[PDB]
Amino acid sequence: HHAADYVLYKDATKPVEDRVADLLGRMTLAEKIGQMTQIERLVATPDVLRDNFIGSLLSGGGSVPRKGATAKEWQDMVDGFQKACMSTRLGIPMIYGIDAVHGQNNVYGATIFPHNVGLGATRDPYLVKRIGEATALEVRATGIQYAFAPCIAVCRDPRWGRCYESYSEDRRIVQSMTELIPGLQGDVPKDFTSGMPFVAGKNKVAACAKHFVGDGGTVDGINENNTIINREGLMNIHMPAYKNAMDKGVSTVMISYSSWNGVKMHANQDLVTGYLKDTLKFKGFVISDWEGIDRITTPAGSDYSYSVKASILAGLDMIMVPNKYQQFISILTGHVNGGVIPMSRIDDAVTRILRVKFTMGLFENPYADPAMAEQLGKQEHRDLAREAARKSLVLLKNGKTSTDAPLLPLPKKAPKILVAGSHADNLGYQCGGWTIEFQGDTGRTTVGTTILEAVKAAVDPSTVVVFAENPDAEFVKSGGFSYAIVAVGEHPYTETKGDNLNLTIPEPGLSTVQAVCGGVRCATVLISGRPVVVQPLLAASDALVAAWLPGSEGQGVTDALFGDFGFTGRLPRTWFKSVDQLPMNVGDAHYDPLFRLGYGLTTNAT
Ligand SMILES: CO[C@@H]1O[C@H](CO)[C@@H](O)[C@H](O)[C@H]1S[C@@H]1O[C@H](CO)[C@@H](O)[C@H](O)[C@H]1O
């Protein structure tokens, strides 16, 4: 259509499938393999990107241009990489991915939403959709086009370090929370075929349903381990939400480290090609996890040639290398040159990668929009996170006996109150893992309101607020306090570091709750990524709230404590009596919970 030097794949008016086909037919082997290669920003340079025809970059957890970097610094970084890719012969833009899994969480000043287990407690798919919308804007604020979310693991054992990344042990809650997908990407159009990738445009991002499949089902919740369940249980528990993801046009799927009955997902042709592609009709791209291919072997990385062969023949399209791109490209090129991997496979992989890039408008807007920078940490997004935090909270106890006055909601006016505990004035702890750093961190890591700060912003100006992290019993008894709010729980963790067989909170936690509640009526706020041993906390406390990992907006906690809204959260997991019972999920034969899935006390707004 019309000029001397017309190249159909560059024509924005043409159908995506014709663009894909036109570009693919022009590409060399090196240009194809390049598309299939995702590298860390930490090993990327202009020359590396250009000479290897690199298709994608990511920031892994904590991989940032520098500490405290502004939205514009992020855009400049991404643009700098993109300029190199757009200068190749074919000018195929790279897509940049990041784990924006509760906001754009690696970024200083990004709104930090509650983690997924709290979101499950909300039972509010529309809220999650809205969080998807806001997240897309904050990810685009930083120039990034692709979020490795949602995690749709159905966590079947809370000893897993990633249980907080699952919305529920009940697949139906997980399925309902796939509304994150059209949040992040835009609603699919009315026609729409299930399994087609979709992204509305430059104000949205490509999503990623992960980690396919049964990541939530590993033995003793060991991270990356074996999931021993039969096809019926796979299909009934761990699969359904992937089908909802297909219907909502999720653009990519990330493969699990885990194995299904001794077969490594990263080598499972029957599930990746047979099921995801050929039965669910997924037409987006399938990405590996980080060194997921290396982990096919034991030790990991010990026969990387076999790792490339097995993964690529299994039907993986893009490999998150992420560092040793030269070895990956060399080996894969060898396999293709040797006839071990047919061109038809390469062409399928690249066809899917390009389909997503074209569909989302990446060839029309490869560069960042500086006007979107102000989306980062935008106050409306914070008000949304604050709403979500509040809705996430599950009230487990409100009075030690049935005839006690309920403690919550607390009055905003009182002569003097105590705020205590390790988790009362620690933003990093209240955000938990995947915040600023991979494993999360302690202290004031980003912009936010701690519980203490929230309490001070909420109360009557005549209320004197005292903070003591770990006061002794006497201090409390002598203080003249009307009540205390005490906040304790788990430290931040991510992935294998949080695999935990005992599930008890670190001390001082319990000892502080005991010393405070022994002296004055107390509301205990429990910060955790999962159910933890809670009977001793409960026995000491007048009221106790499971606040999960509520994120940057700690006023979501005080909104419910002071009665501006009523508690509405409901457990999205079974609260066990003992780790010796685990796994123990709703619907099991021996089902003996401390608190069943669905439990939650309520209050009315005052
Ligand atoms: C963020 O990368 C993590 O890095 C450490 C080392 O830096 C690896 O040991 C971990 O296995 C990965 S976890 C993996 O990371 C993907 C990219 O961030 C993420 O999307 C996925 O959900 C994780 O399983």
User: Which experimental approach was used here?
Assistant: X-ray
From residue 261, alpha-carbon distances to 136, 225, 226, 229 in Å are 36, 10, 6, 7
Helix 304-314 vs helix 325-337: angle between axes, to the nearest 10 degrees?
Answer: 70
Place of tokens 């390009």: 354
From residue 564, alpha-carbon distances to 390, 409, 555, 558 in Å are 10, 9, 11, 8
CA-CA distance, 145 to 140, in Å (whole number)? Answer: 6
Contact 469, 509 (CB under 8 A): no
Q: How is 385-406 classified by DSSP, letter by letter?
A: HHHHHHHH-EEEEE-SSTTSPP
Ligand 1 centroid to Cα of residue 579, in Å, is: 27
Pick left, alpha or beta for residue 361 (phi over 0 → left; psi -120 to 50 → alpha; otherwise beta). Answer: left
Q: List all residues whose CB is within 6 A of at least one atom of ligand 1.
A: 60-61, 99, 148, 210, 289-290, 438, 495
Domain boundaries defined on the chain: 1-377, 378-563
Closest ligand 1 atom to 292 CA: 11
Q: Give the 3-state secondary structure of residue 166.
A: coil
Ligand 1 centroid to Cα of residue 260, in Å, is: 20
CA-CA distance, 584 to 16, in Å (whole number)? Answer: 47
Token representation of residue 285? 């791209």
Separation of CA 210 from chain center: 9
Give the mutation target among 152, 211, 495, 496 for probing the ligand 1 site: most ligand atoms within 8 A of CB: 495
- Fill in the amino acid letter for 467: F
Contact 529, 433 (CB under 8 A): yes
Burial 461-476 (b: 16+ CB within 10 A, else e): eebebbbbbbbeeebb
Separation of CA 525 from chain center: 23
Q: What is the DSSP letter of 604?
A: -
Closest ligand 1 atom to 496 CA: 11
Alpha helices in 157-303 (DSSP H): 171-176, 180-185, 231-233, 240-247, 269
Token representation of residue 69? 């970097």
Contact 103, 144 (CB under 8 A): no
From residue 286, alpha-carbon distances to 209, 254, 345 in Å are 10, 6, 13
Q: What distance separates the 2 farthest-apart alpha carbons in the chain? A: 87
Please name the residues in contact with 244: beta carbons below 8 A apart, sequence gap of 6 or more. Answer: 175, 178
End-to-end CA distance of the chain: 66
Contact 494, 439 (CB under 8 A): yes
- Of 53, 166, 58, nearest to 102 by C-alpha is 166
- Catalytically active residues are 289, 495
- Of 379, 369, 362, nearest to 72 by C-alpha is 369
Q: How is 321-390 classified by DSSP, letter by letter?
A: --S-HHHHHHHHHHHHHTTSS-HHHHHHHHHHHHHHHHHTTTTT--S--GGGGGGTT-HHHHHHHHHHHH
Place of tokens 């009362």: 424
Please name the residues in contact with 242: beta carbons below 8 A apart, sequence gap of 6 or more. Answer: 152, 209, 212, 213, 253, 276, 280
Output the residue whose Cα is nearest ligand 1's atom 10: 290
CA-CA distance, 195 to 356, in Å (whole number)? Answer: 12
Ligand 1 centroid to Cα of residue 314, in Å, is: 21
Token representation of residue 254? 């990330």
**Residue 138 φ/ψ, nearest 5 degrees:** -75, -35
CA-CA distance, 88 to 258, in Å (whole number)? Answer: 37
Q: What is the DSSP letter of 24?
A: H
Closest ligand 1 atom to 148 CA: 20
CA-CA distance, 390 to 118, in Å (whole number)? Answer: 9
Closest ligand 1 atom to 320 CA: 17
Contact 95, 356 (CB under 8 A): yes
From residue 472, alpha-carbon distances to 205, 422, 523 in Å are 50, 13, 17
CA-CA distance, 113 to 376, in Å (whole number)? Answer: 13
Separation of CA 381 from chain center: 17
Please name the residues in contact with 12: beta carbons below 8 A apart, sequence gap of 6 or more. Answer: 363, 364
Give the mutation target among 38, 290, 434 for probing the ligand 1 site: most ligand atoms within 8 A of CB: 290
**Residue 75 φ/ψ, nearest 5 degrees:** -60, -40
Q: Quickly count: other Cβ atoms within 10 Å of residue 339's Cβ.
A: 8
Contact 522, 420 (CB under 8 A): no
From residue 15, alpha-carbon distances to 12, 35, 165, 359, 461 in Å are 8, 20, 37, 9, 62
Contact 573, 379 (CB under 8 A): no
Ligand 1 centroid to Cα of residue 245, in Å, is: 22
Contact 419, 484 (CB under 8 A): yes
Output the residue whose Cα is nearest ligand 1's atom 13: 290
Ligand 1 centroid to Cα of residue 542, in Å, is: 40
Token representation of residue 105? 């969480």
From residue 543, alpha-carbon distances to 283, 394, 409, 526 in Å are 50, 11, 10, 11
Output the residue whose Cα is nearest ligand 1's atom 16: 290
From residue 281, alpha-carbon distances to 143, 235, 284 in Å are 30, 16, 9
From residue 487, alpha-carbon distances to 165, 252, 389, 416, 590 in Å are 22, 39, 15, 18, 33
HSE at residue 73, side-chain half, CA atoms within 13 A, is 10
Ligand 1 centroid to Cα of residue 438, in Å, is: 8
Residue 537 parent element (H or E): helix 535-540
